[PDB]
Design a protein around this ligand. Sequence first.
Ligand SMILES: COC1=C(OC)C(=O)C(C/C=C(\C)CC/C=C(/C)CC/C=C(\C)CC/C=C(/C)CC/C=C(\C)CC/C=C(\C)CC/C=C(\C)CC/C=C(/C)CC/C=C(\C)CCC=C(C)C)=C(C)C1=O
Ligand SMILES: CCCCCCCCCCCCCCCCCC(=O)OC[C@H](COP(=O)([O-])OCC[N+](C)(C)C)OC(=O)CCCCCCCCCCCCCCCCC
Ligand SMILES: Nc1ncnc2c1ncn2[C@@H]1O[C@H](COP(=O)(O)OP(=O)(O)O)[C@@H](O)[C@H]1O
Lengths: 70, 230, 116, 17, 50, 167, 98, 175, 450
Amino acid sequence: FQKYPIPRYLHVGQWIVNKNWKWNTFHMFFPTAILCFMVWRNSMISTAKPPNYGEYVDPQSPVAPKAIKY
Amino acid sequence: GDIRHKFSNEITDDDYDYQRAMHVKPPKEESLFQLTNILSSVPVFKTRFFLDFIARNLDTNSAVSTSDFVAPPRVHENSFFVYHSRELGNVIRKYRSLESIVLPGALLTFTYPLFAAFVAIPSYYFMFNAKIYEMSRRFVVRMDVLPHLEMISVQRIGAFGILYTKLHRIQDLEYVPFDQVKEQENYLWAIGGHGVDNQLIFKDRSTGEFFYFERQGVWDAKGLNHPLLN
Amino acid sequence: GAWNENQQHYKYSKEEIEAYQVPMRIKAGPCVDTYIPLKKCFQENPTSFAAKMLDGRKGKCAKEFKYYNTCLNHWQTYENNSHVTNAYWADTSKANADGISNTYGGSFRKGLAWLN
Amino acid sequence: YMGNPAVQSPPKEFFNY
Amino acid sequence: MLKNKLIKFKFFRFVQSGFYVDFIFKKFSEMFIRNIFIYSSIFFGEKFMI
Amino acid sequence: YYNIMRQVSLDSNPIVLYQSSTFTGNGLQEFYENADALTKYLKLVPFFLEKNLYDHPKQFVIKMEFHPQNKVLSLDCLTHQGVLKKTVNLENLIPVPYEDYVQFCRRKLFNAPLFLDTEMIYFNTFQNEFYVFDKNAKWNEEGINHPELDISKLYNEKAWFDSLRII
Amino acid sequence: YAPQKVVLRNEKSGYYANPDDVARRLIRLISLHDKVQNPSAITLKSTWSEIGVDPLSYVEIMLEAENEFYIELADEDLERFRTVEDAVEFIARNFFTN
Amino acid sequence: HGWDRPDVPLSFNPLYVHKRELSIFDTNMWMYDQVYPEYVISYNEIHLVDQWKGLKESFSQSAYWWAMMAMVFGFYFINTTPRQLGIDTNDLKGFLGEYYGQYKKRSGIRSNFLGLDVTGENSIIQPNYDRKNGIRDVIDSLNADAGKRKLINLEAKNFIERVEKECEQRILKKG
Amino acid sequence: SSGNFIVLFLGWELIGLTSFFLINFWSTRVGTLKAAFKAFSFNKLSDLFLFFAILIIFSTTYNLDILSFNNQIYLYESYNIDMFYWSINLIEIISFFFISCAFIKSAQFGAHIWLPDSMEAPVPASALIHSATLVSAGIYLLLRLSPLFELSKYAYFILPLIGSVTAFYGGLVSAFQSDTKKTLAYSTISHCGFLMVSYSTGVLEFVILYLYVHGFFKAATFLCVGNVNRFNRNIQDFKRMGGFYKYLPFECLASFVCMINLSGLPLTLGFYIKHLLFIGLVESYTLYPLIFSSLILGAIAGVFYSYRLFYSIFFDTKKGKKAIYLQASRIILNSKFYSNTSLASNLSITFLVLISYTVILYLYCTTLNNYYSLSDLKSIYINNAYSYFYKPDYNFLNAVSILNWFVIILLISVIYLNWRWSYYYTKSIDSLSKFILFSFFFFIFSKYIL
Ligand SMILES: COC1=C(OC)C(=O)C(C/C=C(\C)CC/C=C(/C)CC/C=C(\C)CC/C=C(/C)CC/C=C(\C)CC/C=C(\C)CC/C=C(\C)CC/C=C(/C)CC/C=C(\C)CCC=C(C)C)=C(C)C1=O
Ligand SMILES: CCCCCCCCCCCCCCCCCC(=O)OC[C@H](COP(=O)([O-])OCC[N+](C)(C)C)OC(=O)CCCCCCCCCCCCCCCCC
Ligand SMILES: Nc1ncnc2c1ncn2[C@@H]1O[C@H](COP(=O)(O)OP(=O)(O)O)[C@@H](O)[C@H]1O
């Protein structure tokens, strides 16, 4: 579509180009990556995976599912 | 208006040569492995035996039409020629000749001829009856006029590629408007009425026979401008 | 001897089935005894999906795949009754006369298109 | 009941703020 | 079959319009919206009942 | 529209309009004798393949006479079997370009030899076939400028622009 | 980029397409009609009746002009056109003329 | 290119002028906008005057597809034999076994583990181990089909054993 | 990726609202607002159904973990809920609500009407919505809760019937659509119905394969038709197209590949998934005649819409406007940079097709190979549908042959039928005759002589 003038006072995103977008991309990507790394560690503390190939669950081990003793 | 000459890295016409196999363009050069170059370079094609084989096989020059006027051989001694089909009649006859080899071949070579017939029945009724066959039945392959009877001899194509000639009285001929036969036969005129003249449709009213004439067919002025045919 | 038996004639326990991660579809069938060595060999012989999809002998996993393929053929034939069905298809009159399986033969209709 | 598709003159007497 | 009504634009239009299912559903939805929200809820419900 | 046929004859005093320089001879035997004519014939072999196998209606004209009294053309065309004489009614000939000639055939034609005159295709609408001339040839300037060959007598907008459409 | 200052809408010449190009294309399209005897007698100030265009011929010519200029013209506007100059002015000032 | 186009005109968003009274009986029946207001529901198939005429037209034109479906079903019905489909008969103690085991053990109606004098029946969502409906029909059909396939395999084995015995008798008898 | 029903409901509401925002991208238009609001209303009804199903599950089991619910729902099969004057089975009511929620999102007959109106969204949005995601949410609901639907009589009756009806309806309407986006939307409706049928077959591997193939090739076709629409300047109907092969060469060729894969044409991955669908179709349904007829008519409908879209867009006559063609063919524009699309678009579509082929081949090798190497699907309902894939009988082969020959006859019809006068009309009939004779002789020679 043909470009048309945009009011200077309006904080809209129509045909908005930031000449310094590279540093903004750097400083919006890397700290986001660090935040997600911290959240990833926190969630990896509480993570469950089935036994690997060749590994079985001993039914009498504490890891095995348990039933309530009334 | 093109400005590719102003720039060096701009694409040239020689780069647009792989598109010649996909885009029609007047010839510029002959490649090493082009068929013409192969035929004109290998000496085995210069030998007389290949030249004689080519000059005596494939299409013959006797079958090539040598004029824009043709007089087909008379069907009867007294009859005079009026109209003849050119290529649609040939294609119709070659298509209906398939029933003479493919249909028996289907019986003798298909594991399930009943399956073949069960799939062919709806193909005929839903697609092929209104496409080729019914047009062929009403197609006028040839039309001459016998003056002693004051009748028209119409030669048509039958089921297995047959040819048969029927006589229709001139006074019983009527003109059938396309709008008169438009809605009742819309499917035929939708998929199988393009090669025949829908604005030139006739009918023998005694038997309800429809006469369709090919758009590419040839008409004789002498026969058409006859007092019997007005 | 039996098609479900593997090369070593060894039956696998529930713990071994769990440890070797047998798919439930294979577990439902009777071919776990022949499937388990094949999966063990494939784990010991990691190959790309193209290798499995192209090799007809399954490469290194040859004997294990032979045993598993015999078991699979028998298993899918019996789950299909395809032997009886093909016997009745080849000659419906002779199969009925011989009484291969009256239960299937009493409700068998070949179809008009297939040679009546 | 439904609105009138016909073009009507602007109201002269109507409740206002 | 020399006469076919499945190639006329009437049948083609019918099929292209999705068998008129959307049209019928939207007509019934307008019926419901008018008869429930306006006449029954705000007029009968609020003007009369409330 | 309708291919109404009219009887035609010859004037017995034809005016030469076109003559292929390479294909000067009685027929295919003398074409074999000529070294250049033989090479051109071998290059025209795929042209004949398109003509026969692909059912592309085409003729390679090596000579052309004109009869103004009957308004007829007297083409002598070359095919894989030799030279054949064809008479074309003047009103049945229209100009057509290389793109129309190629796109008429649904099959992809073989790469054309360099001696085909791609700018001068002539379509016979009655016979529905193309005529292609040779690049190295003598066009009789006096012959082609005959008053009966003038477009003011021959040009018909509907036939020249609207009759032949390739879709 | 934007000059960072307030800049108003530029009306410029007021034509979204070249008026002379539009007029020439329209006159060429009109001359294509079978009932227009003299293409060289067509002027922007000329009337449709003056250039021998009946109402139905005008309808056909305007439909083909709509096809050519990549726009559609309302019947009220089409009846509003009294001269080729008016038609060209309306087409050139249209934002969708192409 | 080739012309200095002015800016996009304000006519691209024409101002809508209200010429009619906005009835309260059409409340929210219109998408209101100062440019191009619309009715809340669009009827592209307005050539059908009503929804009843639309239903009549739909059922009249859908008859062709009913006929085509009938033709396809007839073609596949006079030319195809029903297949041997069902649950895997090598695992009947699984999906089929668990269903009947649950309907047999009746563990949902046992006594409370504390003696609270309340069982599973004392709830809005309560067990019913004598229901005999729902998916039980499909379960019974699957079990019957599995039994039928097992019987077919057994009959085939018996037939082959009988054929082998008959051949042995025939060859041995002649000597 | 939900682990609980609460994360499931959160994702349901999130996809609903994000689809509403995607559909209503042209916020300045109220004509877009009404379509987005219809989609929003259907999403809210789906949310109601999902919430009520989750509430019933919680009131029954006091549990929201999906694994725990799946592994213990079998204990509650013999249960009923006293709702008003009726005693509805516990599995039946939960399955009814989940199935209604799935049918609204994964567009089925009746609840499909929002999907054709959701084409006001930009082409990338429509590609994401229709290929996967929004219309695959119901398939995810069915697959994630597979043990629940194995024990439901309502599922057994409603999944195949509604799936077949939806497939037939969508394919048939797509075969008649002149808009490219509407054509692909109705194709998506048809393939969602086919996915429902595939789930009703009891084989989840076939469902996964069909989902992957349809998503990949529908997305690629959506991108191609989006480039075509942009070139045509926001005119989506192909009645104003034709001759775009020269202006959009890459679009033409990529669209050809993606349509022959998508429409289930023979010798393609779509053909494989359709054949797998017909392998496992159960024949014990009361309404099997209608179901099977609808499935056949919807499976044969891919040829029509694929051929119509491709030929009308690229190789028909020039039905478009002169401004579209002439402005892109000026001699000044001739350069090595000339393109009516973007190099980035071309590379994206090429890599999408390549990765789609690789992933579909990997899935086929993991599932359809003799050595079954797929991971556990957490389903204990194992039928014998794989037997006909491994060791089929002759009757099934002959039935699939019937289907293949129906497809062949439809191909013959679409290729050779002349709906308009042409100079090649006679030669087209001649070509058909010689093709029939050549096919007969080729069959004779390849089977008996040598
Ligand atoms: C073409 O669609 C249609 C649409 O598009 C999907 C539509 O949008 C709409 C528009 C609808 C609305 C606006 C709202 C209405 C809502 C709906 C859900 C309507 C949907 C309508 C249909 C899906 C069409 C159904 C109509 C018919 C006539 C069914 C078509 C199938 C046949 C005619 C096949 C005939 C079957 C026969 C003869 C079976 C005979 C029995 C045997 C051979 C015994 C076999 C032995 C067994 C063990 C098998 C058991 C089989 C049984 C019991 C038969 C039962 C099955 C039946 C079908 C009766 C309409 C009207 C429509 O119309
Ligand atoms: C009692 C009557 C006996 C005779 C009945 C004759 C009915 C058929 C008449 C038409 C025959 C011509 C069409 C088929 C030509 C051979 C094609 C072939 O190889 O078939 C193999 C097979 C032969 O294999 P088969 O029959 O031995 O067994 C394997 C095939 N199944 C399992 C499906 C049966 O031929 C057929 O299946 C024939 C089906 C014909 C269906 C109707 C066709 C109508 C359209 C005609 C044009 C077709 C163009 C070519 C299409 C195929 C190629 C792309
Ligand atoms: N408030 C309303 N009440 C009833 N009908 C309306 C209303 N607004 C619009 N319409 C209908 O919608 C159509 C749109 O008309 P509109 O575009 O506003 O007038 P015009 O066509 O003169 O610009 C009208 O013909 C009218 O029938």
